């Protein structure tokens, strides 16, 4: 997260850190708890992941430095990638992780609601991106989870900024005209969380962008409301 600030414990309890364990253990992507056995993340996270066997899902984590050889994690039973996914920039960048067992929800591990049936025309004005990613283009994975409030932009404007890409109704963009706040390397797969009527909704999945927080180059997110039928079909 560029232009952001550190979070405190329990502030984003649906945020997870997905680690790979090959060839060495490291943060791979963010993700979001949406059910006791289900994480929603980006499909591009699994490029070159040989199988679910090498994945570890850590919930309840503020600082990456909390993760030690005895820290409890969830195994991944299945990675479910959207059938039409090819690469992040061309859409369908969404994946479900089915965990091996059920998350018992606690103060630090909670689900976030999907965008609701009948809220497709809501204008979200309180949206936040969170993650352990870079604070600049040439940086490092951060120890402490970062947060940044970012405004949504219209799909018309977003397409104008990315005339070499197909910005469809299945994407949503977010960023300041002048730049300065955005996701960056290591934030992908995590949530774009928006609060409406004091309830948090998973509006986007962090997907791709041109550089980090550049002027007139918003971050591009998978538009989760357009995938709710797909999620419900896979989680039942
Ligand atoms: C894990 N890690 N550890 N050290 C490095 C990494 C690492 C490296 N790239 N990434 C991912 C892709 C691969 O993900 C996983 F497979 F590695 C990635 C790709 C794109 C974005 C992104 C960007 N944007 C553009 C530029 Cl340039 N930089 N960022 C801008 C806006 C939005 Cl909205 C975005 F989403 C974020 N991320 O995270 C993780």
Asked how this structure was determined, the answer is: X-ray
* Annotated catalytic residue within 188, 193, 201, 207: 188
Check residue 4 and report its DSSP letter: -
Q: Resolution of the experimental model in angstroms, please? A: 1.7
DSSP category for residue 92: -
Q: CA-to-CA distance for 95 and 77, rounded, in angstroms?
A: 13
Question: Which residue(s) pair with 17 in the sheet?
Answer: 30, 58
Compute the distance from residue 176 Cα to the ligand 1 centre, in Å: 19
Parallel, antiparallel, or unpaired: how do β-strands 152-153 and 171-174 relate?
Answer: antiparallel
Residue 117 burial by Cβ neighbours in a 10 Å radius (0-12, 13-18, 19+): exposed
Per-residue H/E/C for 122-170: CCCCCEEEEECCCCCCCCCCCCECEEEECCEECHHHHHHHCCCCCCCCC
163 marked as part of a ligand binding site: yes
∠ CA 107-126-132, nearest 5°, is 55
Beta carbons of 5 and 144 less than 8 angstroms apart: no
In degrees, to the nearest 5, what angle opens at C-alpha 155 toward C-alphas 207 and 112?
Answer: 50
CA of residue 185 to ligand 1 center, whole Å = 3
Which residues are bridge partners to 106 per DSSP? 109
Number of Cβ atoms within 10 Å of the Cβ of 85: 17
Catalytic: 72? no
Residues with Cβ within 8 Å of residue 227, at least 6 apart in sequence: 82, 94, 170
Chain breaks in the chain (C to N over 2.5 A) after: none
For domain 15-111+231-235, the CATH architecture is Beta Barrel (2.40)
- The per-residue b/e assignment along 125-156, b for 16 or more CB within 10 angstroms, e otherwise, is eebbbbbbbbbeeeeebbeebbbbebebbebe
Residues 6+ apart with CB under 8 A from 83: 92
């Amino acid at each position: 997260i560029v232009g952001g600030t550190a979070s405190v414990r329990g502030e984003w309890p649906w945020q997870v850190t997905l680690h790979t364990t090959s060839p060495t253990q490291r943060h791979l992507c963010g993700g979001s708890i949406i059910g006791n056995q289900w994480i929603l993340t980006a499909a591009h996270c699994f490029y070159g992941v040989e199988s679910p066997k090498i994945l570890r899902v850590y919930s309840g984590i503020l600082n990456q430095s909390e993760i030690k050889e005895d820290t409890s994690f969830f195994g991944v039973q299945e990675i479910i990638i959207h059938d039409q996914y090819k690469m992040a920039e061309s859409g369908y960048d969404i994946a479900l992780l089915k965990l091996e067992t059920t998350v018992n929800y606690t103060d630090s591990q909670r689900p976030i609601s999907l965008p609701s049936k009948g809220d497709r025309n809501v204008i979200y004005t309180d949206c936040w991106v969170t993650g352990w990613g870079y604070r600049k283009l040439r940086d490092k994975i951060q120890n402490t989870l970062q947060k940044a409030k970012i405004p949504l932009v219209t799909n018309e404007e977003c397409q104008k900024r990315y005339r070499g890409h197909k910005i469809t109704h299945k994407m949503i963009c977010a960023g300041y005209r002048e730049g300065g706040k955005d996701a960056c390397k290591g934030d992908s797969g995590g949530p774009l969380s928006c609060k409406h009527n004091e309830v948090w909704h998973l509006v986007g999945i962090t997907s791709w962008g041109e550089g980090c927080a550049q002027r007139e180059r918003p971050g591009v997110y998978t538009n989760v409301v357009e995938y709710v039928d797909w999620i419900l079909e896979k989680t039942q």
